[PDB]
Amino acid sequence: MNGAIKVGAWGGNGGSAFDMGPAYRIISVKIFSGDVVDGVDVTFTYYGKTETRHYGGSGGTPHEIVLQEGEYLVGMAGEVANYHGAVVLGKLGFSTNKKAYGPFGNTGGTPFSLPIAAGKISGFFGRGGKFLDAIGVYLEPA
C-alpha cells in the first residue's frame, strides 16, 4: 500500500512476523551469526532521531555494515537452511554500490540472491524467534 514494493521474505514460517516499513535513511545493519543467522540490528534515522530495532535472538557474533556518505544497499543474498529442526537463514550478506559484505553464517541449504540492477533497499520485514527465520526488503529508486 501507498506505493510500496516488497520482495521476499526468504526463509521459514516460524518465529514472529516483523515489518520495519520503509526508512528515510538506514544508517547501519549488524548481522549476528554463528552456525546460522541469529538476528539483526537495524539502525535508522527519522526527523533527526537515531533508533535501533533488533529482530531474532540473542546469540551469535556481530558483523556490522556502516553506510558511508553516498553508500547505499544494492543487493542481498544468502542460504535458507534446516537447523535443529527450524527453517532459518543459514547465511546472509549484502552488497552496496561500494563493497560486498559477508555473507555471514556457516550453514548452507537453498541459495537465494537479489541483485538490484536499478534501485536500492529502503527497509526490512521478516520473521524472528530464537534465530532469524526469514528476511525481506522494501525497494525504491536510486
Which residues would be at the binding site for its own copies (CB under 8 A)? 1, 3-10, 110-119, 125, 136, 139-142
Tell me, rounded to whole angstroms, the distance of Cα 1 from its chain centroid: 21
Comparison of 72 and 83: residue with beta carbon closer to Br ion = 72
Number of residues that bind Br ion (CB under 5 A): 3
Please list, residue by residue across 53-92, b when 16 or more beta carbons sit within 10 angstroms of its beta carbon and e when fewer do: eebbbeebeebebebeeeebbbbbbbbbbebeebbbbbbb
| Whether 74 contacts 96, CB under 8 Å | yes
Comparison of 63 and 120: residue with beta carbon closer to Br ion = 120
| 16 interacts with, out of its own copies, Br ion, none, CB within 5 to 8 A per kind | none
Q: Which span sits near Br ion by CB under 5 A: 14-22, 33-41, 65-73, 108-116?
A: 65-73
Q: Contact between 98 and Br ion (CB under 5 A)? A: no
Q: Contact between 25 and Br ion (CB under 5 A)? A: yes
| 112 interacts with, out of Br ion, its own copies, none, CB within 5 to 8 A per kind | its own copies
- Shortest spacing between CB 62 and its own copies, in angstroms: 27
For 85, the 3-state DSSP assignment is: coil
What does the DSSP assignment read for 3-43?
Answer: T--EEEEEE-S-SEEEEEEE-SEEEEEEEEESSSEEEEEEE
Contact pick of 18, 22, 26, 90 for Br ion (by CB under 5 A)? 26
In the complex, the residues that contact Br ion under the rule CB under 5 A are 25-26, 72
